[PDB]
Write a protein that binds this ligand. Structure first.
Ligand SMILES: Nc1ncnc2c1ncn2[C@@H]1O[C@H](COP(=O)(O)OP(=O)(O)OP(=O)(O)O)[C@@H](O)[C@H]1O
Ligand SMILES: Nc1ncnc2c1ncn2[C@@H]1O[C@H](COP(=O)(O)OP(=O)(O)OP(=O)(O)O)[C@@H](O)[C@H]1O
Ligand SMILES: Nc1ncnc2c1ncn2[C@@H]1O[C@H](COP(=O)(O)OP(=O)(O)OP(=O)(O)O)[C@@H](O)[C@H]1O
Ligand SMILES: Nc1ncnc2c1ncn2[C@@H]1O[C@H](COP(=O)(O)OP(=O)(O)OP(=O)(O)O)[C@@H](O)[C@H]1O
Ligand SMILES: Nc1ncnc2c1ncn2[C@@H]1O[C@H](COP(=O)(O)OP(=O)(O)OP(=O)(O)O)[C@@H](O)[C@H]1O
Lengths: 362, 362, 362, 362, 362
DNA sequence: TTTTTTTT
């Protein structure tokens, strides 16, 4: 009798497992009997307890195999291959619906009976976020449509403002919402070539806190970032396929994703200024600070950074009509759940608290 | 029974597939029964639904194999081999004749019954491009000849002028038409060797927005691009075969392809100026912007960036006899279909709208 | 008859052997009869004498294999895979609990009947460490809580004071207790990239001797480190993931670990001062100096460096309920053993000796 | 019939051979008739003539093998694994006995009847070394003990004196005795970090001819050695582990070995002076110079630089109990040989001769 | 039947082929019928005609093997292993013996029945060489002996003399006789250091003309040479091992090989002067150059810098006893030939023609 | 082994 490589590939597929070592370690856990498996019985990880009993017999035979790493290598390549197929064949809209399905699936667990997310704490986060900029939910919707359309040379948004104005905070949540990567371009030009490699097949990117020069007039430290970006002008325009590489990999050629740039108030060359479709100014506000001091469970649990928070904001504010047709059904059920939990006065009480700079809860 | 490596190889030829992961991913989809395959029934992409039913039998047994990446590698090698044989033995006119047939096949689908595109929106785009320069269709025909003849040291066209003059736009559609690559040479020299490795067996190349020096007087940020290019005179001249890199691969020796350079107008040292047979100077023209602004679907469907649009322009403007003889049969049908669909009065009406800067339609 | 790869993997798991050559060498030693084995009889190394009798039969066949290094590689992969699974799934409390179990095992040997270590000398160490700072045991307990909760911004501690004031001693003991790595950020700004690479998957980090500037007024050597630090606030605040690089490896994205900063008396920018929950002032007290002169076995055996010494300090001082609930049983057993061998008056006599600056033992 | 890989592995172990080509070459020699073998009959090389008979049958069958390098590679791995195990498990005192046994084996050859060397010429070297410092043999014994104990802080010895005063000579001999490496820290502070990587797993290090500053007033060339060194106190004290680089390869952590520092009479900061256990300083002496000038076979045979000479000196002067138990039997036999070979009056003549600065032999 | 790998390995040993491709090519030539092999019949190349008939049948089967390069790789390892063995066991005297034995083999066929050269051309070579300075045969024999012993400090000779004074010409020829390299030191300190690893395993080394600092006091253009050498002391003296490095590579330890310095007439500090056994001085010479101008077959066939010309010069001047004791037979055999083919009068006529500066032949 | 890193 022999290992079924097919069953391992199925496990890799259904867990979306990218890493060969993680896959290996996970699969080997199944060799003990599920019947007593404490990880199953304590329901500790779904990517274990859902699968252990199914995969058990093949795991025992796999445990004896002499090829174990080769089998995992084949499985992981299949997961990688499916991503590459999807990168070419899906519409950008349909990609976003898949991503939303996955966040909505994680939310199903978080706010379940199992798991521990207090939906009231998370809704308090939405209140604080909705304060950070005027018409916040409209701003998020405009960004999402811009990311779907990916209109050439209208692909990038610039966040400006003083330090501690929440710009990277807001960038973090958007990145989780869409999926994508942060990049640091203040590097030297040689390392920069490998830095850009991580963009491959990603949907969205964020350039974190690029440095200009001469901002030492406001005591901004100087650095290369702005000048490096103005060399990469082509990559922002997104009109033509560009060549990207990773350590020991031959290049791949694709259109470089859309995204966000964040900075303090250095001056921007006109060449680069013309690449941004929109700029947003962030400013420090005392009531947010005073509220947040009295509300630190927000930060302790990282609610304010997380794409889950933005998704809850959208579900609150936007019509069902604005979602794609497949997910509209789940959207209606979540809208139903939220309204049952929170009346508007309860939500307004929160927003009123934040504006008053008391702790969000009274 | 056992996997036919032959049938896998045949599919790779049919699809003209280079990436082993893209090949692997798509071939695996055929493992499920085509009898109900939703991708077939929704007729989503032809590279699937044409082939699924034929390959299903072999795709099933492939899904069980332990060699999968090895089989895909050999198939990918066969596709790459075909490209290298063609690269040596065909006339440049034959290569382009084959290239046109591929685009025309895509146009059969785009305006077919599946008909996802609208021929009117696409023809509106043609009017917009022909308005971009004097005698546009003549300039296109000149460029094709120059690339086909490939006269040594008379091989390169320089596009120049300010931001948003459109030079990238025009370059993009040409690159699609002829099937080249873009390259970025503003990086430092020690990275550059592997970048140029991309140009192996390519028909055409474009170097994008190569940064110069001294134009800082006009606030053009300085860079290395011009210095890098002037180190590479030989590659422009195409006078003698030169060596090209790939990671983990030994050098390939061949003549470096012809093509196009874009700049916002830094100064060009005369060693480098001597190597351009022609230069075209682009100008911002506000009424185009106003037309675009009221014609959003052009950019959103990326119409004006497509060689498909340029092919439609040539079919509208040029004599049948000017095309390579084998295609002329297809040209006649496309000319007929165009005349059937568009009255010249409609095309005149459109071009008037473009000139007026109203939205193209009325 | 065949080799059992399973038994090798089991030995590698049990020994947690990370290195293929270390694994290979030790396994081959078992091929001689354990019944006569000199290393067994001298009870020299636990990873041998516990295991020789069990694996002897398989080691005899392993000695004839032609595959030997291939067997070992698969085994080492299994141990590495287990670490990555743990890294992604354990709670930080679980991690720390495991680490303590390791130290408790090493203590059972050191103070075992075979053990070389005189528990009295190690208690003298704890008396000296407890004199280093007021409320020393409470201070340690606070630090551990802070590491396990890993609350954003509330993450970093500052050790400050003159040369030869013990800060590196305490840092090393804490780093041993928790596991982690030292980092040097006085480097020029480019090399920092690979330097930060070592933090990958670590529980804890320490920044040595960050050199300020302008402390040359106080004859302090000036250097870059302080400026390098405030340029990394996103790493310290731990609120958002960062990208980390190792030589020859693709980046991984994670929350940067919590840690400790150590310095002599440079001035600190207020922006940087805000990052730290606690600053601890170390000052030289020459009665400790005169004590070490007359208690040198502390230094010679490195007792005052050891996490083992801090663990004994916790066991002696803290209530049982404070320990991770599972291992509380082992803690009680160690408390009982300590109570048996050291009456409070014995320990307090030692502490009084240290206070007098005289030799600890009398 | 089959090659025994086991017999090759034995030969590699018995010869301590760890270059795959060196092993491969020598094993192939055994294919020819042992009975006839000229090398055996010349008794020329022990690693041959001790072995050729034993291995002859297996070497013949190995000569037909289609697989030869794989066998040698596995054998080499066995020898490297043995070193790896030993490096982590042995006591420092056992390492020294191992190192001593090796030298004693080579002396059995050199002064055996087959040996080319003259024990009287080597004994002349011992006398010249003994005159280089008062109580030379006690100095050497103290130094060795210090390295074996490796007591923290009490780890480093300083050699001072004019050029051509022998400090390099003695350091080289000690380093040949114990094993270790030299280092140069006159470098700038960037290159330094790769330079220290040399020390990994070494038993000793030596710092060669560090340059101070302002020694130019004594014509001593200035340099950064001392300033670099005074910043490394944590490496010297040996009280905690440190991180060590290598080019390309990844970082490593260990205690920095004990060692020796050598210089001309620059000043030293008191901060650095406190690092040293023992300042030894060298005068040039004319009679040593004149004696060398009349006994140049010493230099020509490189006797006075050799660790063999130091071992001979220890045997001549030290009590047997000062040697570790295992070697004491060989020590007794060598003492007895030496007593038989030199009556004390011979040695007294040699010493008194050197005191007259005439050539050692008369 | 099947390929004998053994026969291939014998041929590689007998022909001392280092290169896998060269081996493969030549062995394939044997596949055609030896019984009428036209290359054999033309007696073109001993490496073929001496072996074809013997290897014929095996070469036929070799041509049908599917595995050919694998056979050749193992055979090439056998030859490289033989070098690695000898490189670590022979005396320098034996090494030179082999080196001469090789050149005498070349000499045997060079003027064999193929008549492929005329000795008189080389006698004119020898004649011109002996004119270069006094007693040139003795200078060779002495320098040769000097390098064979490699006695410490007594290791370096200095070649003074202007541009185009022949010092380079001489050393290049003498390196053919011995084997070794030339090196440069007129270097910035990085490059100075990274040259040094080239010396690894060199039997002998040379310095290319050292452009000593401030030679422009003599109008000699200069760089770092002098003080670099004066500070690189011990490398000259060869007293103790030194560790040597080249770019990216690791260091390795040996005694630094002996050698010679070429210099134009720069300044020397007596410190650096003291490092040398001999000063020699050079010039272009006017009869000699007018002879070269008239004797150009010497330069055309490279005779005047062949080591073969030095070998012949020794065989002419030096008695048989001065040569390696087994090789002395061949010395007699070649003395016979030259003493037969040339009277001393024809040698005197040639030498007299050099003395007149007239074309050596008359 | 190349590559990446070292080297620059
Ligand atoms: N608009 C704001 N007004 C006041 N406090 C703010 C504001 N935004 C953020 N904060 C506080 O400042 C902290 C840092 O926020 P954040 O990191 O997003 O700032 P940033 O200016 O965007 O930073 P950086 O430029 O370094 O990425 C937050 O955790 C919160 O405590
Ligand atoms: N001639 C033009 N007049 C007005 N608008 C133009 C013109 N050409 C292009 N545009 C607008 O400018 C946008 C960018 O065009 P494009 O990138 O081709 O210009 P470019 O001159 O090559 O710029 P750059 O050098 O900055 O990349 C187009 O998408 C279109 O909206
Ligand atoms: N409080 C103290 N009073 C006096 N001596 C002390 C005190 N603490 C430490 N020592 C002495 O200082 C020596 C060095 O300690 P340690 O390495 O921790 O100092 P440090 O100030 O943290 O040094 P560095 O900043 O150089 O790493 C100890 O071995 C001990 O001899
Ligand atoms: N005590 C001495 N008196 C006189 N000459 C000496 C003495 N010791 C060594 N020599 C001579 O000095 C030569 C060099 O010795 P060595 O390299 O050990 O000296 P050093 O003091 O370490 O020199 P440097 O500082 O130049 O490296 C020896 O080979 C010997 O010829
Ligand atoms: N004594 C000589 N008589 C005639 N020609 C000579 C003599 N010396 C050198 N030349 C000519 O000059 C050429 C260059 O010689 P070589 O390079 O050996 O000289 P060099 O002194 O080392 O030169 P440089 O110092 O300029 O590098 C010789 O090959 C020869 O053609």
């Amino acid at each position: 009798k022999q290992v079924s490589w097919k069953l391992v590939t199925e496990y890799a597929m259904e867990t979306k497992c990218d890493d060969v070592l993680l896959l290996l370690g996970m699969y080997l856990e199944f060799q003990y009997s599920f019947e007593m498996c404490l990880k199953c019985i304590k329901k500790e990880q779904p990517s274990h307890y859902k699968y252990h009993e199914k995969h058990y017999a093949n795991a025992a035979i796999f445990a004896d195999s002499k090829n174990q790493k080769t089998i995992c290598q084949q499985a992981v390549d299949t997961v990688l291959a499916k991503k590459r197929v999807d990168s070419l064949q899906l519409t950008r809209e349909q990609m976003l619906t898949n991503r939303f399905n996955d966040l909505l699936d994680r939310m199903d667990i978080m706010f379940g009976s199992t798991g521990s997310a207090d939906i009231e704490e998370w809704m308090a986060g939405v209140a604080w976020l909705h304060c950070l900029l005027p018409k916040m939910d409209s701003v998020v919707y405009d960004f999402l449509k811009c990311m779907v359309y990916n209109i050439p040379k209208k692909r990038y948004w610039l966040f400006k403002g003083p330090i501690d104005s929440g710009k990277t905070t807001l960038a973090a949540a958007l990145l989780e919402l869409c999926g994508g990567k942060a990049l640091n371009v203040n590097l030297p030009l040689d390392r920069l070539n490998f830095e850009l490699g991580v963009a491959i097949d990603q949907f969205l990117v964020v350039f974190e806190d690029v440095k200009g020069t001469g901002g030492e007039s406001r005591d901004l430290p100087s650095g290369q970032g702005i000048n490096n970006l103005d060399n990469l002008r082509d990559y922002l325009d997104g009109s033509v396929k560009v060549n990207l590489e990773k350590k020991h990999l031959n290049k791949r050629t694709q259109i470089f994703p859309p995204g966000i740039v964040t900075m303090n108030e250095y001056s921007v060359p006109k060449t680069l200024q013309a690449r941004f479709v929109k700029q947003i100014d962030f400013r420090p506000k005392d009531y947010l600070k005073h509220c947040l001091e009295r509300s630190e469970f927000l930060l302790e649990k990282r609610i304010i950074q997380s794409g889950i928070a933005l998704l809850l904001m959208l579900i609150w504010y936007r019509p069902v009509a604005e979602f794609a047709q497949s997910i509209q059904s789940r959207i209606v059920e979540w809208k139903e759940r939220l309204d049952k939990e929170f009346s508007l006065s309860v939500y307004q009480k929160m927003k009123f608290n934040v504006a008053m700079g008391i702790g969000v809860l009274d």
